[PDB]
Amino acid sequence: LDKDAVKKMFAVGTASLGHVPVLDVGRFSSEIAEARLALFQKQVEITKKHRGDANVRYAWLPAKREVLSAVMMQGLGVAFIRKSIYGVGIHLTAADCPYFSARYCDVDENGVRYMVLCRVIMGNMELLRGDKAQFFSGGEEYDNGVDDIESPKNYIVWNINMNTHIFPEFVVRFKLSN
């Protein structure tokens, strides 16, 4: 996608919160990001061959200014791992639902918030049954987890998959009211 489409995705997806000014949309562009994209695209090939369909989706990851620098070289295991009602992994918000996690993006010293748009290899999606103690796939037939099959709001990528199945691509800088 281009930066305008990402901006539009974020604007339509946060409309319910009122005035949400988008200050900037950026894309990670470096030798490490390229190598990390190549790694991700090989996992896409593998998951496609294994399941028939890689089922790559866009999803939103709440971030903060302080972790952006680190994210490409050392991975998502900086600090992005959360425990929810659905289990433990990386929790991302579906493409049309950034309103859901916008407030969970930490404000920096200037009032600015940061949300990352990621490509996620969801593969064969497991409908999650609400197990607090789940930290991996409920079975060999499933890859990553989702809360609702028809209208997804939350994806759970298991810890084992965090570096293979998520490519952080775009950073959206924004503000909210009080």
Residue numbers in the entry: 273 to 350, 353 to 452
Per the authors:
RCD1 is the founding member of a plant‐specific protein family characterized by a central domain with sequence similarity to the catalytic domain of Poly‐(ADP‐ribose)‐polymerases (PARPs) (Lamb et al., 2012). In addition to the central PARP domain, RCD1 and its paralogue SIMILAR TO RCD ONE1 (SRO1) have an N‐terminal WWE domain and a C‐terminal RST domain. In contrast to canonical PARPs that covalently modify target proteins by ADP‐ribosylation, Arabidopsis RCD1 does not show PARP activity in vitro when expressed as a GST fusion (Jaspers et al., 2010).
Our crystal structure of the RCD1 PARP domain provides first insights into plant PARP domains, and we identified several molecular differences between RCD1's PARP domain and the catalytic domain of mammalian PARPs. The RCD1 PARP domain adopts a fold that is overall similar to mammalian PARP domains. Nonconservation of the His and Tyr residues critical for NAD+ binding in canonical ADP‐ribosyl‐transferases suggests that the RCD1 PARP domain does not bind NAD+ and therefore is likely to lack canonical PARP activity. Consistent with this inference, the RCD1 PARP domain is not stabilized by 6(5H)‐phenanthridinone, an inhibitor of mammalian PARPs (Wahlberg et al., 2012), at elevated temperatures. Conceivably, the cleft of RCD1 that corresponds to the catalytic center of active PARPs has evolved to bind other small compounds. However, an independent transgenic line (A) expressing the same construct fully complemented both rcd1‐1 phenotypes, suggesting that differences in expression levels might account for partial complementation in line B. Overall, our results suggest that the integrity of the presumed NAD+ binding cleft is not essential for RCD1's functions in plant development and signal transduction under oxidative stress conditions. Nonconservation of the H‐Y‐E triad and our finding that RCD1 retains its biological function when amino acids within the presumed active site are mutated suggest that the protein does not have PARP activity. Given that the N‐ and C‐terminal domains of RCD1 mediate protein–protein interactions, the PARP domain of RCD1 might act as a scaffold bridging and/or coordinating the action of the terminal protein interaction domains.
